[PDB]
Design an enzyme around this catalytic site. Sequence first.
Site, PDB file in Angstrom:
ATOM      1  N   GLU A 160      38.731  34.133  51.116  1.00  0.00           N
ATOM      2  CA  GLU A 160      37.337  34.428  50.733  1.00  0.00           C
ATOM      3  C   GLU A 160      36.368  33.386  51.245  1.00  0.00           C
ATOM      4  O   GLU A 160      35.539  32.870  50.505  1.00  0.00           O
ATOM      5  CB  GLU A 160      37.239  34.569  49.198  1.00  0.00           C
ATOM      6  CG  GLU A 160      38.146  35.649  48.624  1.00  0.00           C
ATOM      7  CD  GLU A 160      38.019  35.821  47.112  1.00  0.00           C
ATOM      8  OE1 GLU A 160      37.761  34.819  46.414  1.00  0.00           O
ATOM      9  OE2 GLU A 160      38.171  36.969  46.603  1.00  0.00           O
ATOM     10  N   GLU A 240      43.545  42.212  46.848  1.00  0.00           N
ATOM     11  CA  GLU A 240      43.714  41.687  45.489  1.00  0.00           C
ATOM     12  C   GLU A 240      43.112  42.651  44.490  1.00  0.00           C
ATOM     13  O   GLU A 240      41.956  42.512  44.102  1.00  0.00           O
ATOM     14  CB  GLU A 240      43.058  40.310  45.285  1.00  0.00           C
ATOM     15  CG  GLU A 240      43.326  39.245  46.347  1.00  0.00           C
ATOM     16  CD  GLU A 240      42.746  37.895  45.957  1.00  0.00           C
ATOM     17  OE1 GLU A 240      42.067  37.861  44.886  1.00  0.00           O
ATOM     18  OE2 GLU A 240      42.923  36.878  46.701  1.00  0.00           O
TER      19      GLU A 240
HETATM   20  C1  LIG Z   1      33.949  35.539  41.645  1.00  0.00           C
HETATM   21  C2  LIG Z   1      35.271  36.231  41.330  1.00  0.00           C
HETATM   22  C3  LIG Z   1      36.365  35.931  42.370  1.00  0.00           C
HETATM   23  C4  LIG Z   1      37.402  37.063  42.568  1.00  0.00           C
HETATM   24  N1  LIG Z   1      38.514  36.855  41.618  1.00  0.00           N
HETATM   25  C5  LIG Z   1      39.697  36.311  41.569  1.00  0.00           C
HETATM   26  S1  LIG Z   1      40.563  36.390  40.119  1.00  0.00           S
HETATM   27  C6  LIG Z   1      41.766  35.156  40.504  1.00  0.00           C
HETATM   28  C7  LIG Z   1      41.774  35.245  42.051  1.00  0.00           C
HETATM   29  C8  LIG Z   1      42.215  33.934  42.719  1.00  0.00           C
HETATM   30  O1  LIG Z   1      41.340  32.843  42.383  1.00  0.00           O
HETATM   31  C9  LIG Z   1      42.361  34.230  44.181  1.00  0.00           C
HETATM   32  O2  LIG Z   1      42.896  33.111  44.905  1.00  0.00           O
HETATM   33  C10 LIG Z   1      41.037  34.801  44.782  1.00  0.00           C
HETATM   34  O3  LIG Z   1      41.016  35.066  46.206  1.00  0.00           O
HETATM   35  C11 LIG Z   1      40.093  35.665  43.927  1.00  0.00           C
HETATM   36  O4  LIG Z   1      38.883  34.888  43.971  1.00  0.00           O
HETATM   37  N2  LIG Z   1      40.434  35.697  42.512  1.00  0.00           N
END
Ligand SMILES: CCCC/N=C1/SC[C@@H]2[C@H](O)[C@H](O)[C@@H](O)[C@H](O)N12
Lengths: 605, 603
Positions: A160, A240
């Site tokens: 990301e 994801e």
């Molecule tokens: C602003 C919200 C971000 C999206 N949510 C989540 S929930 C948990 C995961 C991990 O952090 C993952 O590495 C990530 O690539 C992802 O960021 N992620």
Amino acid sequence: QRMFEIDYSRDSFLKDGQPFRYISGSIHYSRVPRFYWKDRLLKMKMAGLNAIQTYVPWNFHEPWPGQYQFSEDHDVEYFLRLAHELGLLVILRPGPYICAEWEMGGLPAWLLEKESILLRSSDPDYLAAVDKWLGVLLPKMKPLLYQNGGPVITVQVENEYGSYFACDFDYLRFLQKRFRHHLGDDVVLFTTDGAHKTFLKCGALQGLYTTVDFGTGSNITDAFLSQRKCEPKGPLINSEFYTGWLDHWGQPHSTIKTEAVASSLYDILARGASVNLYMFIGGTNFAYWNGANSPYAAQPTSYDYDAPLSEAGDLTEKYFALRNIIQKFEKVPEGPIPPSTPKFAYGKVTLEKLKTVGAALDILCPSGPIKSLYPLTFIQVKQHYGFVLYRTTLPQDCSNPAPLSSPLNGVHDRAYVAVDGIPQGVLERNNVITLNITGKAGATLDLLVENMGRVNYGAYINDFKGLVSNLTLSSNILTDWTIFPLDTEDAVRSHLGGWGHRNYTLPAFYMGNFSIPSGIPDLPQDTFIQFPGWTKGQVWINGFNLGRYWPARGPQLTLFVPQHILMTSAPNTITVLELEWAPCSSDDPELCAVTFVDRPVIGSS
Amino acid sequence: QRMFEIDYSRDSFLKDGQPFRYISGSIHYSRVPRFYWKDRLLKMKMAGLNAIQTYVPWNFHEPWPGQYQFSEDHDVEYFLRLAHELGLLVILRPGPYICAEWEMGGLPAWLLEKESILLRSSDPDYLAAVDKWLGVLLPKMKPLLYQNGGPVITVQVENEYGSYFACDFDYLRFLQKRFRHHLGDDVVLFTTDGAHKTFLKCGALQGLYTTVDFGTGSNITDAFLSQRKCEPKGPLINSEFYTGWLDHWGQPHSTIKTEAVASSLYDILARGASVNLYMFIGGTNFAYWNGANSPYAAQPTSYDYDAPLSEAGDLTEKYFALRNIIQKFEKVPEGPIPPSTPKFAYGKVTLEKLKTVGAALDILCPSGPIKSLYPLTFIQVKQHYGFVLYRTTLPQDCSNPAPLSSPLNGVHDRAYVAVDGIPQGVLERNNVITLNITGKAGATLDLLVENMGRVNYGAYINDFKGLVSNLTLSSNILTDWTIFPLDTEDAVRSHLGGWGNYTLPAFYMGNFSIPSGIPDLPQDTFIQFPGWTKGQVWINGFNLGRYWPARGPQLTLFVPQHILMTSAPNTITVLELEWAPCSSDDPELCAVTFVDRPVIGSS
Ligand SMILES: CCCC/N=C1/SC[C@@H]2[C@H](O)[C@H](O)[C@@H](O)[C@H](O)N12
Ligand SMILES: CCCC/N=C1/SC[C@@H]2[C@H](O)[C@H](O)[C@@H](O)[C@H](O)N12
Ligand SMILES: *[C@@H]1O[C@H](CO)[C@@H](O)[C@H](O)[C@H]1NC(C)=O
Ligand SMILES: *[C@@H]1O[C@H](CO)[C@@H](O)[C@H](O)[C@H]1NC(C)=O
Ligand SMILES: *[C@@H]1O[C@H](CO)[C@@H](O)[C@H](O)[C@H]1NC(C)=O
Ligand SMILES: *[C@@H]1O[C@H](CO)[C@@H](O)[C@H](O)[C@H]1NC(C)=O
Ligand SMILES: *[C@@H]1O[C@H](CO)[C@@H](O)[C@H](O)[C@H]1NC(C)=O
Ligand SMILES: *[C@@H]1O[C@H](CO)[C@@H](O)[C@H](O)[C@H]1NC(C)=O
Ligand SMILES: *[C@@H]1O[C@H](CO)[C@@H](O)[C@H](O)[C@H]1NC(C)=O
Ligand SMILES: *[C@@H]1O[C@H](CO)[C@@H](O)[C@H](O)[C@H]1NC(C)=O
Ligand SMILES: [Cl-]
Ligand SMILES: [Cl-]
């Protein structure tokens, strides 16, 4: 000649010339003991998944530059072979930043020895270290590529990047060139970003396939349209799909309803999309491997994540409902599923105090302290994780309480304060920057500072830790520091030197033993350790660091204990490092105890 | 130096000169795999027992004269050293007759090569056999006596001899003399009989301490009065306090309420009596080891017994209940109790037909059959257990059905009849002595005969098995027999040679795999036979016992995990005697199922 590619013509992957769509689940080999890798992977296979996805945390494999860990619980090569032997394909996410609710998003803390380093950028020092890490890691993954006879079908570049402030496309082009150099021109390289143009703007790159992520709250049509703007042609991919969600200490435990997950999965699959379930098994942040978010909030030890497989690998209702969804699209393997492991309540185990941290300084810090006029960070004293004891003397009489403070809020992240061996309470990042203390002029002032976890997401991943700015006493900057990096892990494994080398209480190590009989086929079993009356600390069993306990905040009140670290006939030694308050003063030794139970309590308030 | 003795002053045992009483549970090492010996014994210890009690089944150790089995699952000496290591004393019950719902009460079937032998008596051939056996067994037990640093504190001579018709006191005195010769003058020797003068009369003997047995239904004061008549001084002892009770095929599974056992147990202990709980764990009659009572009814494969520990060793409500009783009298050990083993349903496994018994005789009988004018017994053709094939040809046309009958009820115990390979049905001891058959003259009349287990109690323990009297066809004696002893255990271990409303008796086989590298697999399981009728079952060549879902109460058989592998497939082999669910073109019916709970109490 084995081939895996994107067919842009037909919006599909081709595997050996045949159309292919993956149904994947995340498992992090760093969050599962190797003992259980095959068990988790076989349950993933029996759910109907045809692939798994994992992260390679750089800090898990290169604790100092040029010093590598690729054996036992760190054997990523073996994990990938194991997946391949089970008939699973692999989507590899080697970073170099992975986020992942993991310490500093996977980046080694020693990167911070350059204080002004701009992580995840074309900073030449960051790039030089990444390049060196990729020269070690990538040639290891090359034979595991699908085309070379292994399981790895796609490989993610960065994680990301579009969410980060820097927007350094030079950085992403440098990653791409180096992944190409090591892995070849045929491997599918992709990126992942939130499903919105605001994120895709800085996350996407010519030559890397653009995928998105989104969970049960997102409009599926909108999300894949955001993807379609960057990739008009090729497969729809959700890298994801959130099956659950992360926790923080003191906040209730996140859950997502099985129905919501099953329903969104069906709709995603019905579009023809490849999808990865994040997490499928979450597992555990053992030792100090958890991350944190900003404003500072550490994620806890359990990474259960409310995943289809629970922390200890149990089949849940969610698991069976997602298996059912998958079965509507694909034939799922026949035969019985490997079970949830048996759990056993070993019961109550008494501990007793062995030594305070202050008494164990000789064994914790065998090469001696570092002296400095002003405080140094964890990074500057060459400690990345755990605790660092900061010591000075009081320059004034403080018979009446004097305020000890960090005016710039530089206690990162918690400090347990004592004066001439009398605990004074705690200083806390953000919440409490001033503590009144008493003691005589010339008294020893000790701060035991804990790294609670380096932020793993946002701008502030350059989280040094320690006392990162000055302390004042009565508004006067305290000088002349003696700083003891603490080798807690070594020390616990030598029983604070006892085994040789072949309201608050003082931070201290409490130790206790229990036996398990030999010749019983079903012992030892997995268990869960609970800490009634304790407050906050770190726990080891037979020198294996099980992680952090904090029943004062919750929601996790038990820690997972895997059977393979427990021994029969020979005593199992529990070590508890209690930081704040231990239930061990009163002459009722029976209160100074932990309890092994046969069910988790990761929900109780 | 250690001492165990009766003190006739304190009405007590003395161990090393101090007052002692025992609280013991029965466990039969022959009925629990050695893989699980330590598990069961430690669970016994954690219940608060300070001793165990066990039978030595002679036929489990001397299958043929001078050929001995003392290794692995037959390693009695190891079992006693294991008990000792865990801090358990041992009450040893070496027989030579043990009763025990066990094939012929433990007596070797080869004793019946003397047709007229009077078992459990002064019969000189019976005594010479016993004496040779004691001369092998007792020198092995001597170092394990308490006085020599082992666990064994008392030893039982014979078993309920007072219940046997013979009343031969010279037999008892011979045993006393031989046990003393091998074990010395210090070992406490005892006898056990039903708690009533009618049983004690022929069971008690001077120089052997007299004990009784009884269960929850008996008046406890009166039972001990009956003992006191015989031993006016010494410890009160109930050598078999019944925690449950035996089963028979076709009868309701026996149970005994926890409340009753706990209540009686507390009463017995409170009197200061030594006591043994029969059974504490019962276990399994694997292969052909089950016994039978008169009039003929065989006990089933399970010896669950409704004991405090289940057949598979599980901790029951009865277990915790008796533990709590024992706790009122003795501090019980601390720490958690080893758990009930995890159980796994492996699911459905399809079998296919391998070979009928008929088509398999080359491999089941490589020595060739025995010819005889009239039928011979299992003993006479040198087979003790399992199945024997009796073959003749029809001496008259039978287009109209003719009565095939055993006028003297001499089918011991069940015969599966075929004429020219067409199943005709079943003859059964005490129950079906005539069966109409059809066929042409010259046709092959086959009778597959099953030894369903030799009677272990009562007068008729000299139970030869086979066709023990003649068979008649249209009231005429059938002659000219061709008899095949069947090596079922070898043939099943070689996959029947090949090696890389009724149906004909036949073997069916299938495979199932268990994954390797899974810390908790394999697990224990229970095998179930929906659609099958009656037969024998092996897994990986281990004969797990007899199945009979057609009669019950036992539906499932216990399968211990240690015979299950992950490195190569596991093979199941079923010998189905009556009707197999495999003729339909649906192969999926030709199958068994593994489940994670037992069904031993089917209605
Ligand atoms: C602003 C919200 C971000 C999206 N949510 C989540 S929930 C948990 C995961 C991990 O952090 C993952 O590495 C990530 O690539 C992802 O960021 N992620
Ligand atoms: C007819 C009832 C008499 C007492 N009951 C039972 S119940 C099962 C046990 C064993 O058969 C034991 O071997 C025998 O010594 C004992 O016979 N017994
Ligand atoms: C999602 O968005 C589309 C337009 O992109 C809209 O037509 C549809 O109704 C929305 N569905 C849901 C469930 O919000
Ligand atoms: C410290 O003590 C002063 C009194 O000198 C008081 O005003 C202040 O509230 C105290 N601070 C804390 C953080 O307890
Ligand atoms: C501590 O104090 C002085 C300001 O007087 C400053 O020079 C120094 O940088 C400060 N150090 C830290 C670690 O904050
Ligand atoms: C715990 O066991 C270890 C290993 O024997 C020993 O060093 C330590 O002294 C033990 N404490 C107790 C009470 O057994
Ligand atoms: C047992 O018999 C005795 C007499 O011998 C009698 O007094 C007693 O009440 C009986 N006990 C029970 C429970 O029936
Ligand atoms: C079976 O035996 C009976 C005895 O009365 C005989 O009368 C009858 O005919 C027989 N039945 C058949 C089907 O052969
Ligand atoms: C069978 O009958 C024959 C001839 O009458 C007789 O001699 C023999 O004793 C009998 N044999 C058996 C085993 O009944
Ligand atoms: C072993 O097991 C399978 C059942 O999965 C069976 O079909 C197969 O025929 C068996 N193997 C051999 C060599 O007979
Ligand atoms: Cl992942
Ligand atoms: Cl016994």
